[PDB]
């Protein structure tokens, strides 16, 4: 029943400089590694198909240019937000896009901070933990242009959020609990960012789907061996 709960019964739900628990190259499988390696063969086919289309269309140079820009713009956007919320890139559309979201953000308790689940044995790096319109949540910022477009599905974004909150709720480095999630899609053209707020009930529904992905990963033979070390969110 409560063998793998998202919520920690023992931690305070409510409960001033944000936590940055460092992350190093490690052999604990990350949240994004788990999701990437357990994408449905149907999803993998769609992304590989689109990858081959883009290589042919753009050429090897044009492909390198495209992938490099979307990756770096994804990273720069995240670095900017980490600098904004903790004591050059500010003219971007992505930053302009999140302004109406950032007005409603307060009580930032963590930023780009490692989370490791003590029972389930996965690790990750959550973007931010803060109150959005008074409600504490794990926030994950997203760019409308995917930073790793051929190995990521936007439709896995709710699972990534619930993985982080679950991990954080069962991590002795964190003394509080988090019950809600938020995904924020910033648009490259400066259009207002879209918030997808996830209450406790919805997080629990997606958490169940995350455990199915996590077990599907640990069902494999190669993942019983110790992975090669990597820094992965
Ligand atoms: Mn991140
Ligand atoms: Mn993010
Ligand atoms: Mn990764």
Residue numbers in the entry: 98 to 112, 118 to 189, 199 to 344
Article excerpt on this structure:
MGME1 (also known as DDK1) is a highly conserved, mitochondria-specific DNase. Human MGME1 (HsMGME1) protein is composed of 344 amino acids and belongs to the PD-(D/E)XK nuclease superfamily. However, in contrast to DNA2 (2–5) and many other mitochondrial DNases, MGME1 can cleave various types of DNA substrates with a preference for single-stranded DNAs (ssDNA). Structural analysis and comparison suggest that MGME1 follows a two-cation-assisted catalytic mechanism of substrate cleavage.
The apo-HsMGME1 structure belongs to the P43212 space group and contains one HsMGME1 molecule per asymmetric unit; the monomeric state of HsMGME1 is consistent with our gel filtration profile and a previous report. In the apo-HsMGME1 structure, residues 1–97, 113–117 and 190–198 are disordered; the β3–α5 connecting loop (aa 255–264) resides right under the helical arch. The side chain of Phe261 forms a weak hydrophobic stacking interaction with the side chains of Trp152 and Lys153 of α2; the backbone O atoms of Lys257 and Pro258 form water-mediated hydrogen bond (H-bond) interactions with Tyr168 and Thr169 of α3, respectively. These interactions may help stabilize the conformation of both the helical arch and the β3-α5 connecting loop. Though Mg2+ was not present in either the crystallization sample or the crystallization buffer, the crystallization buffer of the apo-HsMGME1 crystals contained 100 mM Mn2+. Two well-defined Mn2+ ions were captured at the active site of the apo-HsMGME1 structure, which was hereafter referred to as HsMGME1-Mn2+. In addition to three water molecules and the side chain OE2 atom of Glu344 (the last residue of HsMGME1), the B-site Mn2+ was also coordinated by TLA and Asp238, via their O1 and OD1 atoms, respectively. The average coordinating distances of the A-site and B-site Mn2+ ions were all ∼2.15 Å. Unlike many nucleases, which coordinate Mg2+ (or Mn2+) through the side chains of three or more negatively charged residues (Asp or Glu), HsMGME1 coordinates Mn2+ through the side chains of His180, Asp238, and Asp251, and the main chain of Trp252. In the HsMGME1–Mn2+ structure, the C-terminal residues 337–344 of HsMGME1 are well ordered and fold directly back into the active center.
